[PDB]
Amino acid sequence: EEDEEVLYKVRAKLFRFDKDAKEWKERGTGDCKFLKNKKTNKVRILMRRDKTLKICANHIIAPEYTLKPNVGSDRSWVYACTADIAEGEAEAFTFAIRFGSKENADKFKEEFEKAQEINKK
Amino acid sequence: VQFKLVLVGDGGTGKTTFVKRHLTGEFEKKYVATLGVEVHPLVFHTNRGPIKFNVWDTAGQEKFGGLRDGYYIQAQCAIIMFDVTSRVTYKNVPNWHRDLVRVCENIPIVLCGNKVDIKDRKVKAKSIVFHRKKNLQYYDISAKSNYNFEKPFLWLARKLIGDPNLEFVAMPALAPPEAQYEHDLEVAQTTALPDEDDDL
Amino acid sequence: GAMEGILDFSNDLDIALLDQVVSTFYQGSGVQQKQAQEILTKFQDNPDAWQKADQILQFSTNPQSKFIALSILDKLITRKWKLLPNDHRIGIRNFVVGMIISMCQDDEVFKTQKNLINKSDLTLVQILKQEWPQNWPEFIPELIGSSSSSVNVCENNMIVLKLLSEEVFDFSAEQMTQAKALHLKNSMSKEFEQIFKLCFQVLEQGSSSLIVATLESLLRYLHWIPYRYIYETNILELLSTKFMTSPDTRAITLKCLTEVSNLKIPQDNDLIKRQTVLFFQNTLQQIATSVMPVTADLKATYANANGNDQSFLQDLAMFLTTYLARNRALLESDESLRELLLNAHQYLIQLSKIEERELFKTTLDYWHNLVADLFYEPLKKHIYEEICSQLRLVIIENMVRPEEVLVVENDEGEIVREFVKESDTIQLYKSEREVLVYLTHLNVIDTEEIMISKLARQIDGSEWSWHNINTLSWAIGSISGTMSEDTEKRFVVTVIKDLLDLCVKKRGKDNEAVVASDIMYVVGQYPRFLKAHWNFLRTVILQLFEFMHETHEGVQDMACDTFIKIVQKCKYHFVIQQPRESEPFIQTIIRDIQKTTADLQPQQVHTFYKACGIIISEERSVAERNRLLSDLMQLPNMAWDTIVEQSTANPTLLDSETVKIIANIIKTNVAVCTSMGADFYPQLGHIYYNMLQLYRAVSSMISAQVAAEGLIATKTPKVRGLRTIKKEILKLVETYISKARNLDDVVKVLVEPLLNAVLEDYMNNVPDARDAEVLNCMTTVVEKVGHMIPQGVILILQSVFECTLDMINKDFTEYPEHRVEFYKLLKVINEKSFAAFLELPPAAFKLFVDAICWAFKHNNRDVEVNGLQIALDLVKNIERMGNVPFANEFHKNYFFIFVSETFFVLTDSDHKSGFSKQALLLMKLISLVYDNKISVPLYQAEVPQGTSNQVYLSQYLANMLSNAFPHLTSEQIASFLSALTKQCKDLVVFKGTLRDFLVQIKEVGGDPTDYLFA
Ligand SMILES: *[C@H](CC(=O)O)[C@H](C)[C@@H](O)/C=C/C(=C\[C@H](C)C/C=C/C(C)=C/[C@@H](C)C(=O)[C@@H](C)[C@H](O)[C@@H](C)C/C(C)=C/C(=O)O)CC
Ligand SMILES: Nc1nc2c(ncn2[C@@H]2O[C@H](COP(=O)(O)OP(=O)(O)NP(=O)(O)O)[C@@H](O)[C@H]2O)c(=O)[nH]1
Ligand SMILES: [Cl-]
Ligand SMILES: [Cl-]
Ligand SMILES: [Cl-]
Ligand SMILES: [Mg+2]
């Protein structure tokens, strides 16, 4: 956070997909940030919950990830993450992330892809 | 570095939902009645270091009450919960307090009025005075909206650590690391997200 | 596993194993704790488990084990005590008493096992409730005697008495029958004289732990004991002096003294007055000398939170406010008492400066009480001039954000739109306003001086801060109405001039946001001023219009709210042609509506339109009004007209951008209709038929989509968008019909096509595709014109009754909106068009009865309440028909169904909220028979010929109760029904008997004579 440049920031609500149960469960609401390491040039997603400030997302924006639409929403994305360490130990998740608006959703995707090309270099 | 917290109140008031929200961030819509008690560790990061609550989430339904006051033995702090849309839940607050303070004689306790997100409030602001004489902290809360959801724990922590200037702080973020998923992704896309009519 | 052994009762209880399991639960974690927990619960629940208690108490080395043992006994005593043989009663009593004795004698045990001793004491107290005094006459004298022998025993005895007094006086209402509560209260009263003597002696002979215990017992006694024990003894002196000095005793004493300030007290007794003065005087003297002087910074102290300081200051605030609220007049007339009165208040001032919201509310309640009295009571306000002056400062400097002010400061130091409503400060603001309003009236000069000069100190920059300008601005708005128009006029001028200055000077977007929010708040709070100052008014509204273009979203949103807030009070001045103006201002607003609202969000646009509608309805000339309505609707009506063409050419508004446009058109209509009510009709006429056509088309789309994609489709934005159209259409019609003055047109023009468009569509959709709003619309329709459309009412029922019932009758949770609206619909139909139910086939009428009883089994208050009301209204409806076959058949078919079903929810402990209306319904049904208002036999010859319905009812009920509650005696049941029936005309007595029955069913051996209580 000290050795990191904030490339993008948007307020979001993040969900994880419970497979066992057949439902999306909310994982946090707050500022979703795109952080670029000044020393490694790697770009991650870092999201913390409001008030608590507890980390609810912490993963590299891997080049291989793809933002897919959700059948219920025009202001959300869904994608498979293979290495999120918000809870501590690296774990696979199917994330969904919803925004205040379609504009906000679209701006995120664009930024998301820009970050991916950075992580390619 | 840990404290036993008992959580008490009538059935349906949102105790377990409140805890879950703190635990995992989720909002549980379904009412599955707690059977006896459910113990849950809950850590918070603060400027005075991390604080650990061992949350004893007790059953509100008489029929499911389990050991009842047995759960309160050696509790170091508490939360009494009611439902601002259910007047009877407020009426019962002195009964829960009685049972509680009989076991736990000198502990910090938060009174919480849950479900304030609901349009048709029944227990008026003005009515809520039980806490005054009993030296309880009071908060309007909503586990659903997250309105003041952090407040009970922030207060309790200030009291138990004995530092009124205690704040919640951001936990430093360690650098993250650098094919049945195709089936699993599809199921996720096609399962609608909840509460699509919310502001977020 | 190893742990489960304690559950096998055929084997002896392995105490060691027990302790392991308990330890594992209390000190363990994870899966093992969980398993231990389940085992212990099972063990505890075993109805023979109590037999193990003595054993556990004896050999256990684990206090929690013994605690649990006691909980097991407790349950036994409270529920099955009288089921036990006499031997077991004595035996239990003896080892409980013996345990207590034994634990009190060992000092170490007494010191380190307070929880177990307390639990033990409570358990004794439970035995008393059952046995005392009838079978334990000497318990109090023996308690008293034992006290003299040991400090430990004595102290513990006080704990027992405290608990006893609690159980008897404080907590008996819900836990005992009227008769038993009276019995125990009386018993305690008859023996209090000796109890008090012990209590007094101990307090004179001053052990701190003992004194504290004794004092805690006193606090409880104070709730009920005669006043003479307080006033005719030296006890007040002791409490107000001795026990205030040491801090170990101060907390409790203060609480005792608070309770004393509420005792039952003669008004015309000079001496008692003197004593009530003396104890206050003493107490305040001890505070001043032993704790802190009146000058002390309590804000600081509280914030530091040392030791027990916060709870002390809380208790002090409680003491002072309680006492003064009741007794302050005793200090107001005597010159020698003036200092004391003022000092007391000065403490309260200092307390009011503390940063604790709940505490602040406590003191604010007191201030309100004071000022409201000073406003009316003569020759009083001068006494408090200095107190009030200080108070004005405190409040002005601690004004909480009004609901209207939409900007707030974030953690980054940025002024931004609030994320959510600060719901918890609504009542606080009101209370602050109330007090301040009163204070202004008490001294308008002082208030104005404080405010004007505080404001000056913002301009020149000496005291400038966001916090400071905010609190001030809010306070200024909040005192609106307090001044005369003339003073107000001058006052407001000065304030605005300065705020304007302030705006000119404090640049930057954050500052500008703050100054804007504040000016809007102030101007919106002073309509009277606005009404008198047209030029000014006009300029404000234009400025608001500029704010509607603000990039700052907070300011923008507030501009919209203020506009409507202002219009709501000043609409008249917008509708007339002002002197020196070319046109009424409404004309100007409408002309430029597209420009003004360009940057607004739709909901904001709708608010704007709504406001315009408020203005337009001031115009009472029909021709001129309709013309304004037409003009206002110009843009939506043209958007509309063009869509109606395209749509009718080809039903393929599948385009989502069109869907949003349509939705917003209708939403705009809703917005205008809301404010225009009955006046909206001509506009409704323009769009109505096409609107209903559009409802049909969209409905087809939704169905087509479901068929093609499945239920999931309902979740898609497309389908949600389409439904919004349907919902908003339903809303518009609902809104208009609810306000309509011309009911004939509603029936003749509106209703047939509405029904045609909506009913069949609802009926023939799959459950998930059905809009609850249909039900809601139908309710308003029935409510307003139901009497005029009996056949239409039939049609509604036919279309929604069964298919909705089938949605909501599998569980209590699914389709929650439908559920709520369904019962509101049946309520209104039952009220206004009962004929519709008469026409139902018998099968459907049975479902209706079922539907009703299903309603009162909900915990959901929204459903539950309507359930009971319908049941009650239905009975009335039937009754009103008189001795006719339908009424007869109804009772034969359903009387007992209603009786039994009502009893079930009364008695199941899961429907406690509906008690009152349940009782009412039950009383009606019983009274029907008691009054011979049922013309036919409720039986059939299952019983003898000519047997009264009265006699049969009793028989039915006895049998019902006997079978439902087999642990009750026949006499208990008989006694209960006798009382209940006799009392079926007195709801309050009747309710008491019901409550008594609820207590008795929870135990065994309930005394039947309890139902003779009177
Ligand atoms: C900053 C302004 C700046 O940079 O100058 C703030 C944020 C403004 O954008 C906000 C303005 C608002 C309201 C104003 C109060 C409306 C303007 C009123 C005005 C100038 C009215 C004229 C017509 C007057 O009457 C003037 C000349 C007179 O001095 C008034 C102000 C005093 C009166 C009315 C005397 C009388 O007897 O009538 C935000 C809503
Ligand atoms: N609208 C709203 N609903 C809430 C809120 N908190 C909980 N609920 C709802 O209330 C219901 C009961 O919640 P639950 O946590 O089981 O309450 P509980 O006090 O643990 N019940 P028990 O004492 O029987 O274990 C659930 O349907 C839940 O979704 C809230 O803040 N707002
Ligand atoms: Cl114990
Ligand atoms: Cl007006
Ligand atoms: Cl009998
Ligand atoms: Mg629960």
Coordinates of C-alpha atoms in Angstrom, one line a residue, chain B residues 2 37-42 52-56, chain C residues 3 20-37:
Chain B
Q2 CA -9.4 -12.9 23.7
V37 CA -25.5 -21.9 21.1
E38 CA -23.0 -21.4 18.4
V39 CA -19.4 -20.3 19.2
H40 CA -17.5 -18.3 16.7
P41 CA -14.2 -16.6 16.8
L42 CA -14.2 -13.0 15.5
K52 CA -10.3 -11.4 19.6
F53 CA -13.9 -12.0 20.5
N54 CA -15.1 -15.5 21.2
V55 CA -18.8 -14.9 20.2
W56 CA -21.4 -17.1 21.9
Chain C
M3 CA -18.1 -38.1 26.0
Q20 CA -14.4 -33.5 31.3
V21 CA -17.3 -32.9 29.0
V22 CA -18.2 -29.6 30.8
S23 CA -14.6 -28.5 30.7
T24 CA -14.5 -29.4 27.0
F25 CA -17.5 -27.2 26.3
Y26 CA -16.4 -24.2 28.4
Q27 CA -12.6 -24.2 27.8
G28 CA -12.4 -26.1 24.4
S29 CA -13.1 -25.1 20.9
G30 CA -13.9 -26.3 17.4
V31 CA -15.7 -29.6 16.8
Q32 CA -15.0 -31.0 20.3
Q33 CA -16.7 -28.0 22.0
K34 CA -19.7 -28.4 19.6
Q35 CA -20.0 -32.1 20.4
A36 CA -19.6 -31.4 24.2
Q37 CA -22.3 -28.7 23.9

